[PDB]
Write a protein that binds this ligand. Sequence first.
Ligand code: MG
Ligand code: MG
Ligand code: MG
Ligand code: MG
Ligand code: MG
Ligand code: MG
Ligand code: MG
Ligand code: MG
Ligand code: MG
Ligand code: MG
Ligand code: MG
Ligand code: MG
Ligand code: MG
Ligand code: MG
Ligand code: MG
Ligand code: MG
Ligand code: MG
Ligand code: MG
Ligand code: MG
Ligand code: MG
Ligand code: MG
Ligand code: MG
Ligand code: MG
Ligand code: MG
Ligand code: MG
Ligand code: MG
Ligand code: MG
Ligand code: MG
Ligand code: MG
Ligand code: MG
Ligand code: MG
Ligand code: MG
Ligand code: MG
Ligand code: MG
Ligand code: MG
Ligand code: MG
Ligand code: MG
Ligand code: MG
Ligand code: MG
Ligand code: MG
Ligand code: MG
Ligand code: MG
Ligand code: MG
Ligand code: MG
Ligand code: MG
Ligand code: MG
Ligand code: MG
Ligand code: MG
Ligand code: MG
Ligand code: MG
Ligand code: MG
Ligand code: MG
Ligand code: MG
Ligand code: MG
Ligand code: MG
Ligand code: MG
Ligand code: MG
Ligand code: MG
Ligand code: MG
Ligand code: MG
Ligand code: MG
Ligand code: MG
Ligand code: MG
Ligand code: MG
Ligand code: MG
Ligand code: MG
Ligand code: MG
Ligand code: MG
Ligand code: MG
Ligand code: MG
Ligand code: MG
Ligand code: MG
Ligand code: MG
Ligand code: MG
Ligand code: MG
Lengths: 46, 62, 102, 95, 77
Amino acid sequence: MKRTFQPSVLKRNRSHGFRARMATKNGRQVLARRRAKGRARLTVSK
Amino acid sequence: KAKELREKSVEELNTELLNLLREQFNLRMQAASGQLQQSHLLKQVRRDVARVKTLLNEKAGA
Amino acid sequence: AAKIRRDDEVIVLTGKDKGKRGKVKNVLSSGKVIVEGINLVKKHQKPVPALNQPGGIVEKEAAIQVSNVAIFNAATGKADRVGFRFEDGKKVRFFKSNSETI
Amino acid sequence: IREERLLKVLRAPHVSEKASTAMEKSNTIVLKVAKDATKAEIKAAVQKLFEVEVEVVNTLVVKGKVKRHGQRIGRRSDWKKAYVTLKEGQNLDFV
Amino acid sequence: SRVCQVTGKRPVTGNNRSHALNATKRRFLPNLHSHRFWVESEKRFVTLRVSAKGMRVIDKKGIDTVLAELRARGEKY
RNA sequence: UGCUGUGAGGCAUGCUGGAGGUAUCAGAAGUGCGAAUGCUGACAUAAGUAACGAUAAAGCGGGUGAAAAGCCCGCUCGCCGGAAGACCAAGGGUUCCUGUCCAACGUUAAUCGGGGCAGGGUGAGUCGACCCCUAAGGCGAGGCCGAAAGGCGUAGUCGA
RNA sequence: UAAGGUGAUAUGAACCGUUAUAACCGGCGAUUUCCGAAUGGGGAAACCCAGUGUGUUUCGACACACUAUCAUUAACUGAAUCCAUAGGUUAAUGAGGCGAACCGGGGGAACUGAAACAUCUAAGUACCCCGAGGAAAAGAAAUCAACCGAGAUUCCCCCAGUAGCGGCGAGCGAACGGGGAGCAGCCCAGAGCCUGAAUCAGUGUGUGUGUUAGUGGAAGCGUCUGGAAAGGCGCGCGAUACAGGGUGACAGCCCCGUACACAAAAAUGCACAUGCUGUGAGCUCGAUGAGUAGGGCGGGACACGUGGUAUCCUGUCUGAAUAUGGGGGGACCAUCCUCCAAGGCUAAAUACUCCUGACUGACCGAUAGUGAACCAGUACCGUGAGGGAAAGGCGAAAAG
Ligand SMILES: [Mg+2]
Ligand SMILES: [Mg+2]
Ligand SMILES: [Mg+2]
Ligand SMILES: [Mg+2]
Ligand SMILES: [Mg+2]
Ligand SMILES: [Mg+2]
Ligand SMILES: [Mg+2]
Ligand SMILES: [Mg+2]
Ligand SMILES: [Mg+2]
Ligand SMILES: [Mg+2]
Ligand SMILES: [Mg+2]
Ligand SMILES: [Mg+2]
Ligand SMILES: [Mg+2]
Ligand SMILES: [Mg+2]
Ligand SMILES: [Mg+2]
Ligand SMILES: [Mg+2]
Ligand SMILES: [Mg+2]
Ligand SMILES: [Mg+2]
Ligand SMILES: [Mg+2]
Ligand SMILES: [Mg+2]
Ligand SMILES: [Mg+2]
Ligand SMILES: [Mg+2]
Ligand SMILES: [Mg+2]
Ligand SMILES: [Mg+2]
Ligand SMILES: [Mg+2]
Ligand SMILES: [Mg+2]
Ligand SMILES: [Mg+2]
Ligand SMILES: [Mg+2]
Ligand SMILES: [Mg+2]
Ligand SMILES: [Mg+2]
Ligand SMILES: [Mg+2]
Ligand SMILES: [Mg+2]
Ligand SMILES: [Mg+2]
Ligand SMILES: [Mg+2]
Ligand SMILES: [Mg+2]
Ligand SMILES: [Mg+2]
Ligand SMILES: [Mg+2]
Ligand SMILES: [Mg+2]
Ligand SMILES: [Mg+2]
Ligand SMILES: [Mg+2]
Ligand SMILES: [Mg+2]
Ligand SMILES: [Mg+2]
Ligand SMILES: [Mg+2]
Ligand SMILES: [Mg+2]
Ligand SMILES: [Mg+2]
Ligand SMILES: [Mg+2]
Ligand SMILES: [Mg+2]
Ligand SMILES: [Mg+2]
Ligand SMILES: [Mg+2]
Ligand SMILES: [Mg+2]
Ligand SMILES: [Mg+2]
Ligand SMILES: [Mg+2]
Ligand SMILES: [Mg+2]
Ligand SMILES: [Mg+2]
Ligand SMILES: [Mg+2]
Ligand SMILES: [Mg+2]
Ligand SMILES: [Mg+2]
Ligand SMILES: [Mg+2]
Ligand SMILES: [Mg+2]
Ligand SMILES: [Mg+2]
Ligand SMILES: [Mg+2]
Ligand SMILES: [Mg+2]
Ligand SMILES: [Mg+2]
Ligand SMILES: [Mg+2]
Ligand SMILES: [Mg+2]
Ligand SMILES: [Mg+2]
Ligand SMILES: [Mg+2]
Ligand SMILES: [Mg+2]
Ligand SMILES: [Mg+2]
Ligand SMILES: [Mg+2]
Ligand SMILES: [Mg+2]
Ligand SMILES: [Mg+2]
Ligand SMILES: [Mg+2]
Ligand SMILES: [Mg+2]
Ligand SMILES: [Mg+2]
């Protein structure tokens, strides 16, 4: 039936995109944790 | 080179630079057409360019 | 500071060629040398039409560890070990036994 | 425009059946150009370097394919293609 | 924030110890007021947010002194 | 495999293996496994069983080929037709088209493919995005507020 | 430094070089697209749109530079409203972000224990937030002692699981005193005299010393076994070098090295030297931190749960004395002793390792050891925060 993931790009990027993280203290802490674990990509970007 | 180029004025270094540009354009135009036997040339010119540029800078720099 | 070089005549200390003498073609980075008439292998070559290469078993020369070859003293007829001194201002090689320059 | 930039624009002739077709029938040549060059600069650069008259330059961008080499997934680089219209006037040839 | 511009009093923390001594977090706020003071030499009314304490101290020191310590500490009045 | 010890064990030795092992007396322990619906990998079992995804349906001739019920060609048959047709947005990202290959993938074979490998392919003053303008909503110089982080909001500046 | 080279998977092509412009190693340089504090405006990161000023050029457009906020100082401007302030614009100087642990401050749990549970405990821990440095913090007595005395702080070992605290339960837990590591004291709250006179900071130079490339660097043959000797057997030699690694098995004497002895054009770390500029010595006479000490009320910190509870901190309400003075000495009072609050700076011994080098291990050896010996924070799973693998070995040589 209608499942849980109905994808949208504009949605995806406003919610989790780079800039969206950088907006806030918490977000920059996420990006800190990721850079510390050494991910391939931090956020969802194209 | 690079002693040789060092003793030339800035104008002359700009004419050589324009000439190397043509030559490098020509060379990769050949290589793009698959008619180029020696690829050894590209590197030759591609690097010489840099040499020239690196001089222009220090003649302006000081 | 490299002891064995191109075109030195050497004698082979170790392997199936032990005792044989020859001339160095070239050196490789891994500390391997390739010597004339030395360490022939029989290699199988799939015929290649582009290079007009026939097939067959080609005897080729396979690299030998440079520890295993000694620089051949022609004076003494013996294998030697090599050392370095400064003659003129230039760095030069000599034989340890008769201490003569090369 | 400066000429120094120009000589850096045009990478290579594009060779293919479509290319040959337009070159013969419509009097048009096909170029791989630097990803960042524009219709202005390509018009300029052909008119300058091949010394022939350009009418108009149409362009597109080719996304490189995705490949596998030994299980590894790579991405061929993008690039820009330019259809370059010459007026019926000039005739450009292959010696 | 609630901060006395004079004495620098700030909110501090402590407890309610009830009759059964159940300890519960709480704060003690400074007692603060927005007030207009007459500066003669400037011929003007400066408005500071100050505790009762602060006011008293302004009476003791004079307002010139106090404002001198506000330019000294480098906080805007 | 043979011998020996009350027992955990020990010794010798045929094949395999192709470079490390270790007496004696001491020392230190990640020191001994069948169970924990134990943890990982491997291989069983049911069993060559159930199942092969809509009860719209197939038949023949020729071609290709190692091999054709399924691929291409032709001929009849049958199903959808307010769709099982045609065009977009979203979403995907090369799946498009050609040649070539058949291990794995395709619930069977596959010569076929949305599979593998190589090449080609997307041409705009006037179609969209960009851009101009704002909605809800967001961010927000100063400003108000707040233990700190921060919250609210003015001028603005974004947002289809 | 050099006879070889053009990084790897990875051959080859095309070349460069062999006595020093091939390559390689280090020192200083040049370049350093775009995103990102991101800083000209915006933005769905790696993009979209500009403004101003120079500079061309056939005059089609191109090049190049500047343009964020905020703090401070200056300059000019400048309302209500006369002076004035606010405000506005330009300019110079700095800040913003990132980062392992350690550090100081601001907030601050619960599980748990108590064989239930509320005081208590866990614990001022986890965690959040701010700030800082290579250390920080602390620090020159309004300190303790006991009628004898000590002489700032920090750290280690005792004292001592004692004195005490505590639903006197569970628990928590000193100090005085002693041995040690280390040791260093200063300035402002002001005048005069002699003045650049101690110190300290900035900068050159010299030598010396470390670092960042490097150079040399001992002495072995025969014979059997074997695919191959470094192994067995025989005779030698080196050792300030028998650390360790590699070579067709297990090499002091084959190669790299190792002990030992050396070297810097240039950049940098520390030392004295010396010059310099800035910083002020010394002496004499003064002076001596008020909404503070204490108090009332409410909390917190002291081992110390309001208790007989001193001592410190302060949200609140108050409120003195000024060396003819004040504080402390575990309620409190007198006597005796000691000390000077309400101003500020200070090395060392101490804690830590994102990171560099060397050495080591009764540490592991691929289900172990890091999640990660392998192109791993990868594939893959999740909208997201996050989760998170599997996977080593032909041989001497590819002779594949
Ligand atoms: Mg057109
Ligand atoms: Mg287009
Ligand atoms: Mg690429
Ligand atoms: Mg509690
Ligand atoms: Mg065997
Ligand atoms: Mg065997
Ligand atoms: Mg054993
Ligand atoms: Mg034992
Ligand atoms: Mg065990
Ligand atoms: Mg078992
Ligand atoms: Mg059992
Ligand atoms: Mg089961
Ligand atoms: Mg397995
Ligand atoms: Mg099963
Ligand atoms: Mg079965
Ligand atoms: Mg059955
Ligand atoms: Mg049946
Ligand atoms: Mg079934
Ligand atoms: Mg059946
Ligand atoms: Mg089916
Ligand atoms: Mg057929
Ligand atoms: Mg048929
Ligand atoms: Mg069928
Ligand atoms: Mg048909
Ligand atoms: Mg119908
Ligand atoms: Mg949708
Ligand atoms: Mg699309
Ligand atoms: Mg594909
Ligand atoms: Mg197709
Ligand atoms: Mg096809
Ligand atoms: Mg199949
Ligand atoms: Mg079949
Ligand atoms: Mg088959
Ligand atoms: Mg395909
Ligand atoms: Mg339109
Ligand atoms: Mg709005
Ligand atoms: Mg603000
Ligand atoms: Mg807001
Ligand atoms: Mg707008
Ligand atoms: Mg938009
Ligand atoms: Mg629209
Ligand atoms: Mg910008
Ligand atoms: Mg805009
Ligand atoms: Mg911006
Ligand atoms: Mg006026
Ligand atoms: Mg900072
Ligand atoms: Mg940190
Ligand atoms: Mg702390
Ligand atoms: Mg606290
Ligand atoms: Mg509790
Ligand atoms: Mg309990
Ligand atoms: Mg704290
Ligand atoms: Mg300090
Ligand atoms: Mg005394
Ligand atoms: Mg002591
Ligand atoms: Mg050496
Ligand atoms: Mg040596
Ligand atoms: Mg062996
Ligand atoms: Mg000096
Ligand atoms: Mg007084
Ligand atoms: Mg008090
Ligand atoms: Mg008081
Ligand atoms: Mg009373
Ligand atoms: Mg009280
Ligand atoms: Mg009690
Ligand atoms: Mg009592
Ligand atoms: Mg007191
Ligand atoms: Mg008292
Ligand atoms: Mg007493
Ligand atoms: Mg005093
Ligand atoms: Mg004092
Ligand atoms: Mg194993
Ligand atoms: Mg593992
Ligand atoms: Mg395994
Ligand atoms: Mg994903």
